[PDB]
Design a protein around this ligand. Structure first.
Ligand SMILES: CN(C)[C@@H]1C(O)=C(C(N)=O)C(=O)[C@@]2(O)C(O)=C3C(=O)c4c(cc5ccc(CN6CC(F)C6)cc5c4O)C[C@H]3C[C@@H]12
Ligand SMILES: CN(C)[C@@H]1C(O)=C(C(N)=O)C(=O)[C@@]2(O)C(O)=C3C(=O)c4c(cc5ccc(CN6CC(F)C6)cc5c4O)C[C@H]3C[C@@H]12
Ligand SMILES: [K+]
Ligand SMILES: [K+]
Ligand SMILES: [K+]
Ligand SMILES: [K+]
Ligand SMILES: [K+]
Ligand SMILES: [K+]
Ligand SMILES: [K+]
Ligand SMILES: [K+]
Ligand SMILES: [K+]
Ligand SMILES: [K+]
Ligand SMILES: [K+]
Ligand SMILES: [K+]
Ligand SMILES: [Mg+2]
Ligand SMILES: [Mg+2]
Ligand SMILES: [Mg+2]
Ligand SMILES: [Mg+2]
Ligand SMILES: [Mg+2]
Ligand SMILES: [Mg+2]
Ligand SMILES: [Mg+2]
Ligand SMILES: [Mg+2]
Ligand SMILES: [Mg+2]
Ligand SMILES: [Mg+2]
Ligand SMILES: [Mg+2]
Ligand SMILES: [Mg+2]
Ligand SMILES: [Mg+2]
Ligand SMILES: [Mg+2]
Ligand SMILES: [Mg+2]
Ligand SMILES: [Mg+2]
Ligand SMILES: [Mg+2]
Ligand SMILES: [Mg+2]
Ligand SMILES: [Mg+2]
Ligand SMILES: [Mg+2]
Ligand SMILES: [Mg+2]
Ligand SMILES: [Mg+2]
Ligand SMILES: [Mg+2]
Ligand SMILES: [Mg+2]
Ligand SMILES: [Mg+2]
Ligand SMILES: [Mg+2]
Ligand SMILES: [Mg+2]
Ligand SMILES: [Mg+2]
Ligand SMILES: [Mg+2]
Ligand SMILES: [Mg+2]
Ligand SMILES: [Mg+2]
Ligand SMILES: [Mg+2]
Ligand SMILES: [Mg+2]
Ligand SMILES: [Mg+2]
Ligand SMILES: [Mg+2]
Ligand SMILES: [Zn+2]
Lengths: 136, 94, 26, 38, 57, 78
RNA sequence: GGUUCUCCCCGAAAGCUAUUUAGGUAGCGCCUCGUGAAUUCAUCUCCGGGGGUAGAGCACUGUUUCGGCAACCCGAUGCAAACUGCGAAUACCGGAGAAUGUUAUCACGGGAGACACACGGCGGGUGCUAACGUCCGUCGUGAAGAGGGAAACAACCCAGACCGCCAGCUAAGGUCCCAAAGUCAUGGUUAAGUGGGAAACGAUGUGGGAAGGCCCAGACAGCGUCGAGUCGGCCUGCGCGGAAGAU
RNA sequence: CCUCCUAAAGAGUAACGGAGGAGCACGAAGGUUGGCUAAUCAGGUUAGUGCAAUGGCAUAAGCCA
RNA sequence: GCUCAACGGAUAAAAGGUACUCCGGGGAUAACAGGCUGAUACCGCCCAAGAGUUCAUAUCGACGGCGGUGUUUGGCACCUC
RNA sequence: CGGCCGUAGCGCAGCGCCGAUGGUAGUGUGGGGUCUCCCCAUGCGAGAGUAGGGAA
């Protein structure tokens, strides 16, 4: 489960999630799973998807995770009122914009990569599409 | 080899470019050499099919614009962030 | 270096003289 | 009858059929493969 | 040369700068037509509230 | 159910007081700043808190000058 | 808590600062009346300015993945309110010039009220990008604003009611009947009463489009027969399932 | 009371919002003249600044007399 | 000459109890119920690792995903002091 | 001694540095949607990168 080893600060402003992604090309492998939708991916979702695709390829080839969950998300416990300070960090997310390549794969047939990424995509809260590396 | 039919663009900038792409065309630019850059508009589906061939980026191409044949290489392509579409192509005279 | 060291030594007074608008005997 | 939101062919003998506005899977081989979307 | 400018929509709920521009053109109400000199300064005022005026030139 | 934050200091009203081309009297503060973000040019003094002020009546002029591309404020005597 | 005749003109605030202060009060802000004074003020155009926000980027501060050489280093990939070798739009300050505006500006003086705000838009903190939640910024409306629309509906949309008219034109919104006005025209789509509550995801629903594979050297299906197309992906329009609540 | 962020590139701007500091020190650690240049392991301030943070600082505001 | 630090400093000088209680007020503000919300709860679904001798889907459903209800625990403080 | 402040500095075009055109991002005003985000009209329009410049 991915998490920054250290951070300058513990807690982060909510912020917003506008714009299109940077890192829209298959840069490392042959095939990629690209976000079409916008949202947050939790570290648990990233891990569930990783485990699904890794099992599907039977640990052949190579997988890259292009996203990293570096945004801490706080929550207030049950039965506490509003205010009294910001809540405690509970989990970590990556912000996803449309176009973001989430995962890449190499050293497998396309057919197997497509199946592996279909199984992974079913773990994710964002719509995705299969992409292939391009020359330009 | 690769014959691209193009027209010179009448309007430029964001408004004009988005209107082109809504009408199943896309903007492009020819530069290089010494003659000034030529802003052109291409048919989307035609070029999208051509550039699926790997030799589109390697080999010299011909852009037939206003009758004139201009010989060029593909220098850069801007793809749509998630759809299988072309936003823009840079062609260098070559 | 000797020259660059001397240029550094010279600069403050030179900048002051320019500030004052002084005619300079270098 | 399996009543599910996701109905699919489970083998090569499964057939998708729409009856009275309902997507169904009928299978000649396996009665367990009979499905109705619902 | 002069141009005729008519107010086509209400000033109610418009930004303060837009109301100040209508005042600068001397438009007082919907359908009010004014005759103004055709100058860049006047054309800029029209441009600023183009959505609620019409020019007869 | 308590915070160890909740503190801040009073805002210091720093920044540019007279912009380019503004006509000033001698003594007029041009910029309040921390350190020399702007440096004193001709007819401008630098106070103990790095306040730049006019030493002559005239027009404020901003300029980038010298080998470090530093920002200088001058008064064009007017 | 209550505060008694009439008409005319103008018309707030629910903020800042301080307070044994927090539903009180004071100065300032905003209202009114009077007096006085400059092209004083506003809009636009042009000119002079400083920005470090949006966006972007990764040299720096941190964080991050892969590879080459587990550090450094080199190449490739991202991320940041408290990162910046970049950097807008706007906004703001100043100058000049028209036109317009009942001086709209500023100063001083008489009289205040107000210092519980609300919702909506945009930018945010907080909260669960929960709340008709909460806290700022900024604009709008309500407050203190009637009329028309949104079935009904302070705060949304249109629009600012001096009085009278059994005249006329329009706005938002509408034109089959309730109910004023097209059972209007032309070309399409939908068969779900979708329209008129709808998510992952599922499916030979159905319209359009761009490529393709195979095909009279006989494909495709069914049974060598066989005699025309067939096959399955992509993109897109509109529908279908997913869909259980209490008079 | 101070510094940063929130704060929407002038100023200002709230919350039991996010992070840290102060209630001193110094007759030199002040004035001035003259001189000088760091960390790190070649480099070029990655050091330094009496004490937080931010902005500054080589003509040094840093270091020595 | 002030940790007058509650830092624009009520006095030089000050702690508690009241279920024995009392007055003026407030739905400006809590406890009930309603309302808004739906984190939580409950219910349903998607993916299918795997269990099920063999076999994912008879039965069950890890890692994760999407909804519905108003239905528990709560949030808010809009109605009524 | 200055102006200028990397097209000007290093190294011995290899770097630094400068840098279009076009597109993209953002955004003022008006309008719209399926509204956590976008789109349309109009105005403004980066950053990065590309061609190129460049041994003041
Ligand atoms: C008040 N008014 C603007 C509308 C109105 O007049 C009516 C009415 N019946 O007359 C309404 O029903 C309304 O009040 C209302 O209740 C609405 C909704 O509840 C509503 C609407 C649209 C939505 C679209 C998407 C989503 C998705 N949700 C947001 C997130 F939580 C997931 C929710 C909607 C929704 O709740 C229509 C309005 C119309 C209102
Ligand atoms: C037709 N009528 C029943 C209502 C109505 O009169 C209005 C109106 N403005 O007058 C509507 O807006 C309405 O027609 C309408 O469009 C609605 C919605 O769109 C709506 C509503 C509630 C919703 C609640 C949840 C969600 C999201 N979830 C996930 C998805 F699967 C469902 C969407 C909603 C929504 O779209 C309110 C109705 C009211 C209608
Ligand atoms: K001044
Ligand atoms: K007061
Ligand atoms: K007065
Ligand atoms: K607001
Ligand atoms: K009003
Ligand atoms: K219906
Ligand atoms: K000394
Ligand atoms: K006090
Ligand atoms: K007592
Ligand atoms: K369900
Ligand atoms: K089985
Ligand atoms: K009560
Ligand atoms: Mg636009
Ligand atoms: Mg039947
Ligand atoms: Mg501060
Ligand atoms: Mg300089
Ligand atoms: Mg009035
Ligand atoms: Mg940003
Ligand atoms: Mg008060
Ligand atoms: Mg108040
Ligand atoms: Mg308020
Ligand atoms: Mg908001
Ligand atoms: Mg509220
Ligand atoms: Mg809200
Ligand atoms: Mg009132
Ligand atoms: Mg009204
Ligand atoms: Mg009404
Ligand atoms: Mg309604
Ligand atoms: Mg309705
Ligand atoms: Mg009505
Ligand atoms: Mg009519
Ligand atoms: Mg009728
Ligand atoms: Mg008809
Ligand atoms: Mg319906
Ligand atoms: Mg549906
Ligand atoms: Mg500011
Ligand atoms: Mg601002
Ligand atoms: Mg304020
Ligand atoms: Mg000293
Ligand atoms: Mg006090
Ligand atoms: Mg009582
Ligand atoms: Mg209440
Ligand atoms: Mg209650
Ligand atoms: Mg409740
Ligand atoms: Mg409240
Ligand atoms: Mg009640
Ligand atoms: Mg550029
Ligand atoms: Zn079957």
């Amino acid at each position: 489960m991915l998490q920054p080893k250290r951070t300058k600060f513990r807690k982060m402003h909510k912020g917003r999630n506008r714009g299109l992604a940077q890192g829209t090309d298959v840069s490392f492998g042959s095939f990629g799973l690209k976000a079409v939708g916008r949202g947050r991916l939790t570290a648990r979702q990233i891990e569930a998807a990783r485990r699904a695709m890794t099992r599907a390829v039977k640990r052949q080839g190579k997988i890259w995770i292009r996203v990293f969950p570096d945004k801490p998300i706080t929550e207030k416990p049950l039965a506490v009122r509003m205010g009294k300070g910001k809540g405690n960090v509970e989990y970590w997310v990556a912000l996803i914009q449309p176009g973001k390549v989430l995962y890449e794969m190499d050293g497998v047939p396309e057919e197997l990569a497509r199946e592996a990424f279909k199984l992974a995509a079913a773990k994710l809260p964002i719509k995705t599409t299969f992409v292939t590396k391009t020359v330009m | 080899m690769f014959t691209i039919n193009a027209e010179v663009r009448k309007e430029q900038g964001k408004g004009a470019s988005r209107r082109l792409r809504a009408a199943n065309k896309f903007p492009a630019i020819i530069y290089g050499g010494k003659e000034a850059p030529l802003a052109i508009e291409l048919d989307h589906d035609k070029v999208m099919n051509m550039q699926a061939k790997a030799e589109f980026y390697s080999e010299v191409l011909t852009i037939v614009v206003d009758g004139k044949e201009i010989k060029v290489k593909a220098q850069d392509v801007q793809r749509h962030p998630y759809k299988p579409k072309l936003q823009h192509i840079d062609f260098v005279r070559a | 270096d000797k020259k660059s060291a001397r240029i550094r030594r010279a600069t403050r007074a030179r900048r002051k003289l320019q500030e004052l608008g002084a005619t300079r005997l270098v | 009858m399996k009543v599910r939101a996701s109905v699919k062919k489970l083998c090569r003998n499964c057939k998708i059929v729409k009856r009275d506005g309902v997507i169904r899977v009928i299978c000649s081989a396996e009665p367990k493969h009979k499905q109705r979307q619902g | 040369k002069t141009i005729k400018i008519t107010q086509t929509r209400s000033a109610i709920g418009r930004l303060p700068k837009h109301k100040a521009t209508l005042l600068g053109l001397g438009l007082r109400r919907i359908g009010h037509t004014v005759e103004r000199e055709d100058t860049p300064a006047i054309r800029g005022m029209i441009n600023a509230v183009s959505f609620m005026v019409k020019v007869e030139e | 159910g308590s915070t160890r934050n909740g503190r801040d200091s009073e805002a210091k009203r720093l920044g540019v007081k007279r912009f380019g081309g503004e006509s000033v009297l001698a003594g007029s503060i041009i910029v309040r700043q921390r350190g020399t973000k702007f440096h004193a040019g001709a007819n401008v003094g630098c106070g103990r808190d790095h306040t730049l002020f006019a030493k002559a009546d005239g027009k404020v002029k901003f300029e980038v000058k010298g080998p470090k591309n530093r920002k200088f404020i001058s008064i064009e005597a007017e």
